Amino acid sequence: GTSKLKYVLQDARFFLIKSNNHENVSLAKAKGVWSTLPVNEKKLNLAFRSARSVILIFSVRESGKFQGFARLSSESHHGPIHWVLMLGGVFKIDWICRRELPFTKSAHLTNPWNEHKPVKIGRDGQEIELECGTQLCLLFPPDESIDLYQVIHKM
Ligand SMILES: CNC(=O)c1cc(-c2ccccc2)n[nH]1
């Protein structure tokens, strides 16, 4: 069902993450980590202290799809990850959904924080307004491999 997912997303903040390649998203799914540009890293650190959940929604450039979404479990930290290419700050993340969602299925959602353009459109780090981001996450196929119980107990 969707009740625990709705609880995790309650009063959350949402950010679009754009990766150059599938390899980095695959590494993030295997290792529970993400790194981003310093300008975006500053935004995510601020948001992490500010909200009960910060959700990253991932899209590989040119894929026409989102590849899943995850919750920050830490601010960025330094001191290695073989990313394909700065990306030195490393966030810990808990995956909420590792399934894909094609952009065709989100064509009815627009992001007020990006001029009400379709939510698929935006730069890496673009914030997605609460209602848009919640509805986007709810569109993904349920990921039955994930138990949100341990996620809820970090909030
Ligand atoms: C592991 N992190 C990444 O692969 C990544 C790449 C980017 C980016 C942002 C703007 C222009 C080009 C690439 N952001 N995150």
Tab-separated table of N, CA and C and ligand atoms in Angstrom:
chain	number	residue	atom	x	y	z
A	1	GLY	N	0.801	-1.212	0.000
A	1	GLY	CA	0.000	0.000	0.000
A	1	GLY	C	0.837	1.265	0.000
A	2	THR	N	0.191	2.405	0.252
A	2	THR	CA	0.846	3.701	0.143
A	2	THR	C	0.857	4.508	1.433
A	3	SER	N	0.373	3.954	2.551
A	3	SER	CA	0.206	4.773	3.751
A	3	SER	C	1.543	5.138	4.384
A	4	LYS	N	2.469	4.185	4.483
A	4	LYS	CA	3.764	4.524	5.062
A	4	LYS	C	4.526	5.478	4.153
A	5	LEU	N	4.380	5.315	2.833
A	5	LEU	CA	5.012	6.238	1.896
A	5	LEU	C	4.468	7.648	2.076
A	6	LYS	N	3.146	7.783	2.199
A	6	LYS	CA	2.578	9.109	2.428
A	6	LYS	C	3.098	9.719	3.726
A	7	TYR	N	3.271	8.903	4.765
A	7	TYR	CA	3.803	9.419	6.023
A	7	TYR	C	5.229	9.941	5.857
A	8	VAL	N	6.064	9.215	5.107
A	8	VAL	CA	7.443	9.650	4.894
A	8	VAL	C	7.490	10.965	4.119
A	9	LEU	N	6.567	11.157	3.173
A	9	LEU	CA	6.546	12.358	2.338
A	9	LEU	C	5.850	13.547	2.989
A	10	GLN	N	5.209	13.354	4.134
A	10	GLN	CA	4.466	14.427	4.774
A	10	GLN	C	5.414	15.562	5.126
A	11	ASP	N	5.095	16.766	4.643
A	11	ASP	CA	5.883	17.971	4.916
A	11	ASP	C	7.328	17.839	4.441
A	12	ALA	N	7.547	17.045	3.394
A	12	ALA	CA	8.882	16.838	2.860
A	12	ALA	C	9.252	17.960	1.901
A	13	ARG	N	10.544	18.036	1.598
A	13	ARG	CA	11.073	18.828	0.501
A	13	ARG	C	11.604	17.889	-0.574
A	14	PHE	N	11.541	18.342	-1.824
A	14	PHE	CA	11.808	17.502	-2.983
A	14	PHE	C	12.782	18.211	-3.912
A	15	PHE	N	13.750	17.467	-4.443
A	15	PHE	CA	14.716	18.053	-5.368
A	15	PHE	C	14.932	17.123	-6.548
A	16	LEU	N	14.901	17.692	-7.749
A	16	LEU	CA	15.214	16.969	-8.973
A	16	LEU	C	16.720	16.790	-9.064
A	17	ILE	N	17.157	15.560	-9.338
A	17	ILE	CA	18.569	15.237	-9.472
A	17	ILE	C	18.773	14.728	-10.888
A	18	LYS	N	19.709	15.331	-11.616
A	18	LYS	CA	19.959	14.968	-13.008
A	18	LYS	C	21.373	14.414	-13.114
A	19	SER	N	21.488	13.143	-13.492
A	19	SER	CA	22.774	12.482	-13.629
A	19	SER	C	23.116	12.354	-15.108
A	20	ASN	N	24.411	12.449	-15.418
A	20	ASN	CA	24.873	12.307	-16.793
A	20	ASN	C	24.733	10.886	-17.311
A	21	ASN	N	24.715	9.897	-16.429
A	21	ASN	CA	24.846	8.521	-16.875
A	21	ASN	C	24.164	7.577	-15.899
A	22	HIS	N	23.786	6.407	-16.414
A	22	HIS	CA	23.181	5.398	-15.557
A	22	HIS	C	24.169	4.863	-14.528
A	23	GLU	N	25.473	4.858	-14.848
A	23	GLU	CA	26.465	4.269	-13.949
A	23	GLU	C	26.428	4.914	-12.569
A	24	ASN	N	26.256	6.236	-12.511
A	24	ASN	CA	26.264	6.897	-11.209
A	24	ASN	C	24.992	6.591	-10.426
A	25	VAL	N	23.850	6.514	-11.113
A	25	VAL	CA	22.615	6.122	-10.437
A	25	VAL	C	22.710	4.679	-9.949
A	26	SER	N	23.322	3.799	-10.748
A	26	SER	CA	23.491	2.422	-10.293
A	26	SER	C	24.389	2.356	-9.061
A	27	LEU	N	25.483	3.121	-9.056
A	27	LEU	CA	26.357	3.161	-7.885
A	27	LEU	C	25.608	3.682	-6.665
A	28	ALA	N	24.783	4.711	-6.857
A	28	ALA	CA	24.004	5.258	-5.754
A	28	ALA	C	23.009	4.243	-5.205
A	29	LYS	N	22.399	3.442	-6.087
A	29	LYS	CA	21.448	2.423	-5.651
A	29	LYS	C	22.142	1.300	-4.892
A	30	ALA	N	23.389	1.004	-5.247
A	30	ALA	CA	24.116	-0.074	-4.593
A	30	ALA	C	24.725	0.361	-3.270
A	31	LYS	N	25.163	1.617	-3.173
A	31	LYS	CA	25.958	2.092	-2.051
A	31	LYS	C	25.208	3.035	-1.116
A	32	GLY	N	24.018	3.490	-1.497
A	32	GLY	CA	23.269	4.422	-0.667
A	32	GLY	C	23.947	5.760	-0.463
A	33	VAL	N	24.505	6.336	-1.528
A	33	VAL	CA	25.243	7.591	-1.450
A	33	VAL	C	24.901	8.439	-2.663
A	34	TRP	N	25.094	9.746	-2.510
A	34	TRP	CA	24.990	10.645	-3.646
A	34	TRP	C	25.928	11.824	-3.438
A	35	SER	N	26.420	12.374	-4.545
A	35	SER	CA	27.222	13.588	-4.518
A	35	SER	C	26.726	14.499	-5.629
A	36	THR	N	26.865	15.809	-5.426
A	36	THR	CA	26.349	16.775	-6.386
A	36	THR	C	27.284	17.982	-6.456
A	37	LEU	N	26.928	18.935	-7.316
A	37	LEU	CA	27.720	20.145	-7.454
A	37	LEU	C	27.695	20.927	-6.144
A	38	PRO	N	28.756	21.689	-5.849
A	38	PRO	CA	28.776	22.466	-4.597
A	38	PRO	C	27.579	23.390	-4.423
A	39	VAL	N	27.093	24.008	-5.501
A	39	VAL	CA	25.927	24.883	-5.396
A	39	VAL	C	24.706	24.098	-4.925
A	40	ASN	N	24.542	22.871	-5.423
A	40	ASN	CA	23.417	22.042	-5.008
A	40	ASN	C	23.639	21.441	-3.631
A	41	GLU	N	24.890	21.097	-3.317
A	41	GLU	CA	25.219	20.535	-2.012
A	41	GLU	C	24.858	21.507	-0.895
A	42	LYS	N	25.087	22.803	-1.124
A	42	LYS	CA	24.687	23.812	-0.150
A	42	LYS	C	23.175	23.843	0.020
A	43	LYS	N	22.424	23.747	-1.086
A	43	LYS	CA	20.966	23.740	-0.981
A	43	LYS	C	20.473	22.525	-0.202
A	44	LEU	N	21.054	21.346	-0.459
A	44	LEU	CA	20.570	20.135	0.198
A	44	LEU	C	20.918	20.123	1.679
A	45	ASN	N	22.094	20.634	2.043
A	45	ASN	CA	22.443	20.710	3.457
A	45	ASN	C	21.481	21.618	4.212
A	46	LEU	N	21.155	22.781	3.637
A	46	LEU	CA	20.171	23.669	4.255
A	46	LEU	C	18.823	22.970	4.396
A	47	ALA	N	18.390	22.277	3.343
A	47	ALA	CA	17.084	21.633	3.372
A	47	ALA	C	17.059	20.492	4.382
A	48	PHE	N	18.171	19.758	4.503
A	48	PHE	CA	18.209	18.621	5.415
A	48	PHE	C	17.954	19.045	6.856
A	49	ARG	N	18.487	20.197	7.263
A	49	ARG	CA	18.244	20.680	8.619
A	49	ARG	C	16.840	21.247	8.787
A	50	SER	N	16.176	21.597	7.683
A	50	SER	CA	14.947	22.380	7.696
A	50	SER	C	13.672	21.549	7.634
A	51	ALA	N	13.737	20.291	7.202
A	51	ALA	CA	12.527	19.545	6.897
A	51	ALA	C	12.639	18.132	7.440
A	52	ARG	N	11.486	17.519	7.719
A	52	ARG	CA	11.490	16.179	8.298
A	52	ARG	C	11.948	15.117	7.309
A	53	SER	N	11.797	15.365	6.007
A	53	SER	CA	12.346	14.491	4.979
A	53	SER	C	12.770	15.350	3.806
A	54	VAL	N	13.920	15.022	3.218
A	54	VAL	CA	14.369	15.625	1.968
A	54	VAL	C	14.472	14.506	0.951
A	55	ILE	N	13.705	14.611	-0.132
A	55	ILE	CA	13.579	13.555	-1.137
A	55	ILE	C	14.332	13.984	-2.387
A	56	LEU	N	15.191	13.103	-2.896
A	56	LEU	CA	15.852	13.301	-4.177
A	56	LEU	C	15.165	12.418	-5.211
A	57	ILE	N	14.775	13.007	-6.335
A	57	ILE	CA	14.103	12.288	-7.416
A	57	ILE	C	15.043	12.289	-8.620
A	58	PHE	N	15.459	11.099	-9.062
A	58	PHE	CA	16.605	10.942	-9.951
A	58	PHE	C	16.176	10.783	-11.402
A	59	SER	N	16.889	11.459	-12.307
A	59	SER	CA	16.680	11.255	-13.731
A	59	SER	C	18.019	11.274	-14.452
A	60	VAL	N	18.271	10.230	-15.233
A	60	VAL	CA	19.446	10.175	-16.099
A	60	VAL	C	19.158	10.955	-17.370
A	61	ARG	N	20.046	11.897	-17.688
A	61	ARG	CA	19.874	12.748	-18.854
A	61	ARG	C	19.719	11.893	-20.103
A	62	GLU	N	18.781	12.289	-20.966
A	62	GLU	CA	18.449	11.633	-22.232
A	62	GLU	C	17.694	10.313	-22.087
A	63	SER	N	17.405	9.853	-20.873
A	63	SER	CA	16.723	8.572	-20.731
A	63	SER	C	15.212	8.664	-20.894
A	64	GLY	N	14.641	9.868	-20.823
A	64	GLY	CA	13.201	9.998	-20.860
A	64	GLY	C	12.476	9.438	-19.662
A	65	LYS	N	13.179	9.210	-18.553
A	65	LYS	CA	12.575	8.568	-17.399
A	65	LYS	C	13.207	9.110	-16.127
A	66	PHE	N	12.497	8.913	-15.017
A	66	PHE	CA	13.090	8.947	-13.685
A	66	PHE	C	13.481	7.524	-13.290
A	67	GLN	N	14.558	7.394	-12.506
A	67	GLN	CA	15.032	6.067	-12.110
A	67	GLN	C	14.720	5.719	-10.658
A	68	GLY	N	14.048	6.591	-9.916
A	68	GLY	CA	13.634	6.279	-8.562
A	68	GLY	C	13.760	7.500	-7.685
A	69	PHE	N	13.565	7.313	-6.380
A	69	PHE	CA	13.717	8.416	-5.445
A	69	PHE	C	14.150	7.895	-4.082
A	70	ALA	N	14.771	8.784	-3.303
A	70	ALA	CA	15.466	8.402	-2.084
A	70	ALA	C	15.399	9.560	-1.106
A	71	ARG	N	15.601	9.244	0.172
A	71	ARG	CA	15.546	10.226	1.250
A	71	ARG	C	16.946	10.469	1.802
A	72	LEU	N	17.333	11.735	1.942
A	72	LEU	CA	18.602	12.038	2.601
A	72	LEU	C	18.589	11.506	4.027
A	73	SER	N	19.657	10.814	4.415
A	73	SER	CA	19.803	10.417	5.810
A	73	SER	C	20.928	11.150	6.531
A	74	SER	N	21.631	12.047	5.845
A	74	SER	CA	22.753	12.792	6.401
A	74	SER	C	22.984	14.041	5.559
A	75	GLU	N	23.658	15.026	6.157
A	75	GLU	CA	24.256	16.100	5.379
A	75	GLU	C	25.483	15.560	4.648
A	76	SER	N	26.091	16.399	3.815
A	76	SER	CA	27.254	15.952	3.058
A	76	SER	C	28.465	15.813	3.976
A	77	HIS	N	29.344	14.871	3.635
A	77	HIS	CA	30.551	14.618	4.413
A	77	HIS	C	31.680	14.207	3.481
A	78	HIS	N	32.898	14.578	3.864
A	78	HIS	CA	34.097	14.288	3.096
A	78	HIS	C	34.980	13.298	3.847
A	79	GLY	N	35.904	12.690	3.107
A	79	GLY	CA	36.852	11.752	3.679
A	79	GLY	C	36.312	10.342	3.794
A	80	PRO	N	35.904	6.487	-0.708
A	80	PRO	CA	35.783	7.196	-1.986
A	80	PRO	C	34.771	6.525	-2.907
A	81	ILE	N	34.196	7.290	-3.832
A	81	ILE	CA	33.182	6.785	-4.750
A	81	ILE	C	33.637	7.057	-6.175
A	82	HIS	N	33.712	5.997	-6.980
A	82	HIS	CA	34.195	6.085	-8.355
A	82	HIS	C	33.086	6.565	-9.294
A	83	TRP	N	32.659	7.810	-9.091
A	83	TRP	CA	31.681	8.401	-9.993
A	83	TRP	C	32.281	8.540	-11.387
A	84	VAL	N	31.419	8.475	-12.396
A	84	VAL	CA	31.784	8.831	-13.764
A	84	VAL	C	31.514	10.314	-13.955
A	85	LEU	N	32.473	11.025	-14.539
A	85	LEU	CA	32.327	12.464	-14.723
A	85	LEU	C	32.354	12.867	-16.196
A	86	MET	N	35.305	18.417	-6.669
A	86	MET	CA	33.952	18.824	-7.035
A	86	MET	C	32.907	17.935	-6.356
A	87	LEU	N	32.645	16.761	-6.935
A	87	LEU	CA	31.705	15.804	-6.357
A	87	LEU	C	32.247	15.185	-5.071
A	88	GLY	N	32.902	15.991	-4.237
A	88	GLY	CA	33.570	15.483	-3.056
A	88	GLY	C	32.668	15.311	-1.853
A	89	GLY	N	31.635	16.142	-1.728
A	89	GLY	CA	30.701	15.992	-0.621
A	89	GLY	C	29.787	14.806	-0.872
A	90	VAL	N	29.667	13.929	0.121
A	90	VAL	CA	28.915	12.684	-0.020
A	90	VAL	C	27.767	12.673	0.980
A	91	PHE	N	26.548	12.506	0.470
A	91	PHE	CA	25.343	12.363	1.275
A	91	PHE	C	25.002	10.889	1.392
A	92	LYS	N	24.575	10.474	2.579
A	92	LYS	CA	23.961	9.164	2.729
A	92	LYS	C	22.472	9.260	2.409
A	93	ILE	N	21.964	8.261	1.687
A	93	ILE	CA	20.574	8.226	1.251
A	93	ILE	C	19.991	6.842	1.498
A	94	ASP	N	18.699	6.815	1.815
A	94	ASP	CA	17.904	5.594	1.888
A	94	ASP	C	16.933	5.583	0.721
A	95	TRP	N	17.013	4.554	-0.099
A	95	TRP	CA	16.135	4.465	-1.254
A	95	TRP	C	14.703	4.209	-0.818
A	96	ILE	N	13.766	4.899	-1.463
A	96	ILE	CA	12.350	4.679	-1.201
A	96	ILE	C	11.728	3.907	-2.355
A	97	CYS	N	12.223	4.144	-3.568
A	97	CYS	CA	11.742	3.426	-4.743
A	97	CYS	C	12.893	3.337	-5.730
A	98	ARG	N	13.256	2.120	-6.143
A	98	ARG	CA	14.283	1.931	-7.159
A	98	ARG	C	13.707	1.657	-8.543
A	99	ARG	N	12.399	1.827	-8.725
A	99	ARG	CA	11.730	1.573	-9.995
A	99	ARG	C	11.696	2.842	-10.842
A	100	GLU	N	11.542	2.646	-12.151
A	100	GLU	CA	11.516	3.722	-13.131
A	100	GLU	C	10.110	4.283	-13.282
A	101	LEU	N	10.053	5.532	-13.735
A	101	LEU	CA	8.807	6.166	-14.142
A	101	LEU	C	9.089	6.951	-15.415
A	102	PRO	N	8.463	6.609	-16.530
A	102	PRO	CA	8.679	7.383	-17.757
A	102	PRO	C	8.065	8.772	-17.662
A	103	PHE	N	8.737	9.732	-18.308
A	103	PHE	CA	8.250	11.115	-18.309
A	103	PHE	C	6.836	11.215	-18.875
A	104	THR	N	6.457	10.310	-19.782
A	104	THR	CA	5.100	10.347	-20.316
A	104	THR	C	4.051	10.249	-19.213
A	105	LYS	N	4.376	9.600	-18.088
A	105	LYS	CA	3.391	9.427	-17.030
A	105	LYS	C	3.285	10.624	-16.086
A	106	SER	N	4.214	11.579	-16.160
A	106	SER	CA	4.190	12.763	-15.304
A	106	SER	C	3.839	14.028	-16.076
A	107	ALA	N	3.329	13.878	-17.297
A	107	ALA	CA	3.062	15.033	-18.147
A	107	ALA	C	1.988	15.949	-17.575
A	108	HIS	N	1.196	15.479	-16.619
A	108	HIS	CA	0.152	16.297	-16.019
A	108	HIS	C	0.613	17.060	-14.780
A	109	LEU	N	1.876	16.936	-14.376
A	109	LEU	CA	2.378	17.608	-13.181
A	109	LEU	C	3.337	18.716	-13.578
A	110	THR	N	3.098	19.921	-13.061
A	110	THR	CA	3.979	21.052	-13.299
A	110	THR	C	4.539	21.532	-11.970
A	111	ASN	N	5.711	22.159	-12.036
A	111	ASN	CA	6.464	22.567	-10.855
A	111	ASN	C	6.356	24.071	-10.724
A	112	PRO	N	5.639	24.579	-9.720
A	112	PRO	CA	5.535	26.043	-9.566
A	112	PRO	C	6.882	26.723	-9.388
A	113	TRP	N	7.892	26.014	-8.882
A	113	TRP	CA	9.194	26.629	-8.677
A	113	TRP	C	10.052	26.639	-9.927
A	114	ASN	N	9.572	26.059	-11.024
A	114	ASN	CA	10.214	26.195	-12.326
A	114	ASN	C	9.209	26.682	-13.364
A	115	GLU	N	8.558	27.812	-13.067
A	115	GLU	CA	7.669	28.487	-14.020
A	115	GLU	C	6.507	27.607	-14.465
A	116	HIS	N	6.111	26.660	-13.615
A	116	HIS	CA	5.031	25.725	-13.921
A	116	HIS	C	5.306	24.919	-15.179
A	117	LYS	N	6.583	24.702	-15.491
A	117	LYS	CA	6.937	23.788	-16.548
A	117	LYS	C	6.720	22.362	-16.060
A	118	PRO	N	6.521	21.425	-16.981
A	118	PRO	CA	6.395	20.016	-16.583
A	118	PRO	C	7.544	19.595	-15.670
A	119	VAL	N	7.214	18.783	-14.659
A	119	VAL	CA	8.158	18.504	-13.574
A	119	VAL	C	9.432	17.828	-14.076
A	120	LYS	N	9.347	17.090	-15.187
A	120	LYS	CA	10.539	16.506	-15.797
A	120	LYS	C	11.569	17.555	-16.216
A	121	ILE	N	11.161	18.815	-16.421
A	121	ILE	CA	12.069	19.855	-16.888
A	121	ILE	C	12.673	20.562	-15.684
A	122	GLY	N	13.987	20.676	-15.674
A	122	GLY	CA	14.676	21.401	-14.628
A	122	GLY	C	16.131	21.019	-14.571
A	123	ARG	N	16.930	21.924	-14.018
A	123	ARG	CA	18.342	21.646	-13.851
A	123	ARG	C	18.558	20.728	-12.651
A	124	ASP	N	19.739	20.115	-12.606
A	124	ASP	CA	20.152	19.354	-11.433
A	124	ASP	C	20.063	20.253	-10.206
A	125	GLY	N	19.341	19.794	-9.179
A	125	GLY	CA	19.161	20.563	-7.964
A	125	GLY	C	17.890	21.387	-7.891
A	126	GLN	N	17.095	21.428	-8.958
A	126	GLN	CA	15.870	22.220	-8.951
A	126	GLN	C	14.919	21.725	-7.870
A	127	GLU	N	14.477	22.624	-6.987
A	127	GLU	CA	13.492	22.214	-5.992
A	127	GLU	C	12.123	22.024	-6.635
A	128	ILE	N	11.395	21.016	-6.155
A	128	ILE	CA	10.040	20.712	-6.599
A	128	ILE	C	9.081	21.000	-5.446
A	129	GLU	N	8.089	21.855	-5.704
A	129	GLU	CA	7.102	22.232	-4.700
A	129	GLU	C	6.385	21.002	-4.135
A	130	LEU	N	5.996	21.115	-2.856
A	130	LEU	CA	5.461	20.002	-2.070
A	130	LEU	C	4.397	19.194	-2.806
A	131	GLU	N	3.351	19.853	-3.319
A	131	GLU	CA	2.244	19.099	-3.903
A	131	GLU	C	2.679	18.387	-5.177
A	132	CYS	N	3.395	19.094	-6.052
A	132	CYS	CA	3.967	18.453	-7.230
A	132	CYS	C	4.844	17.264	-6.849
A	133	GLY	N	5.765	17.460	-5.901
A	133	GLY	CA	6.700	16.389	-5.584
A	133	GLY	C	6.011	15.182	-4.979
A	134	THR	N	5.020	15.421	-4.122
A	134	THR	CA	4.268	14.327	-3.522
A	134	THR	C	3.549	13.516	-4.587
A	135	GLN	N	2.845	14.194	-5.492
A	135	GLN	CA	2.130	13.483	-6.548
A	135	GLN	C	3.085	12.740	-7.477
A	136	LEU	N	4.253	13.321	-7.766
A	136	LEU	CA	5.224	12.639	-8.615
A	136	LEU	C	5.690	11.342	-7.964
A	137	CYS	N	6.062	11.401	-6.682
A	137	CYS	CA	6.491	10.181	-5.993
A	137	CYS	C	5.392	9.126	-5.973
A	138	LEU	N	4.140	9.546	-5.790
A	138	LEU	CA	3.032	8.597	-5.748
A	138	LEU	C	2.769	7.932	-7.096
A	139	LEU	N	3.295	8.490	-8.195
A	139	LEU	CA	3.102	7.908	-9.519
A	139	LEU	C	4.001	6.710	-9.763
A	140	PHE	N	5.112	6.612	-9.036
A	140	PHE	CA	6.057	5.535	-9.287
A	140	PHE	C	5.408	4.197	-8.961
A	141	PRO	N	5.775	3.141	-9.681
A	141	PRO	CA	5.357	1.796	-9.287
A	141	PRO	C	5.819	1.501	-7.873
A	142	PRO	N	4.989	0.843	-7.068
A	142	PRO	CA	5.425	0.475	-5.715
A	142	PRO	C	6.646	-0.432	-5.779
A	143	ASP	N	7.590	-0.193	-4.877
A	143	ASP	CA	8.802	-1.002	-4.794
A	143	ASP	C	8.645	-1.921	-3.587
A	144	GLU	N	8.239	-3.164	-3.857
A	144	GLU	CA	7.935	-4.106	-2.787
A	144	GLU	C	9.180	-4.651	-2.104
A	145	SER	N	10.374	-4.361	-2.623
A	145	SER	CA	11.591	-4.787	-1.948
A	145	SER	C	11.953	-3.896	-0.767
A	146	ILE	N	11.303	-2.748	-0.618
A	146	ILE	CA	11.686	-1.749	0.373
A	146	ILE	C	10.680	-1.748	1.519
A	147	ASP	N	11.194	-1.674	2.752
A	147	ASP	CA	10.387	-1.590	3.968
A	147	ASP	C	10.652	-0.209	4.553
A	148	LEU	N	9.639	0.665	4.540
A	148	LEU	CA	9.809	2.030	5.035
A	148	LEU	C	9.825	2.128	6.554
A	149	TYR	N	9.686	1.008	7.260
A	149	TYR	CA	9.674	1.052	8.713
A	149	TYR	C	10.961	1.661	9.265
A	150	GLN	N	12.120	1.243	8.738
A	150	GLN	CA	13.380	1.767	9.264
A	150	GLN	C	13.599	3.219	8.856
A	151	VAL	N	13.041	3.626	7.714
A	151	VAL	CA	13.104	5.025	7.295
A	151	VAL	C	12.331	5.905	8.268
A	152	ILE	N	11.101	5.499	8.588
A	152	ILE	CA	10.257	6.250	9.510
A	152	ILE	C	10.964	6.450	10.847
A	153	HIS	N	11.753	5.468	11.269
A	153	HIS	CA	12.418	5.548	12.562
A	153	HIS	C	13.682	6.398	12.550
A	154	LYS	N	14.015	7.022	11.422
A	154	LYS	CA	15.091	7.999	11.358
A	154	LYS	C	14.585	9.433	11.405
A	155	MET	N	13.284	9.640	11.256
A	155	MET	CA	12.716	10.974	11.176
A	155	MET	C	12.453	11.566	12.555
B	1	LIG	C1	27.126	11.673	-8.663
B	1	LIG	N1	26.696	12.979	-9.122
B	1	LIG	C2	26.518	13.241	-10.533
B	1	LIG	O1	26.710	12.406	-11.356
B	1	LIG	C3	26.065	14.624	-10.951
B	1	LIG	C4	26.332	15.261	-12.180
B	1	LIG	C5	25.695	16.512	-12.079
B	1	LIG	C6	25.683	17.601	-13.154
B	1	LIG	C7	25.127	18.846	-12.905
B	1	LIG	C8	25.136	19.817	-13.901
B	1	LIG	C9	25.696	19.551	-15.139
B	1	LIG	C10	26.252	18.311	-15.390
B	1	LIG	C11	26.244	17.343	-14.391
B	1	LIG	N2	25.132	16.563	-10.901
B	1	LIG	N3	25.348	15.431	-10.223
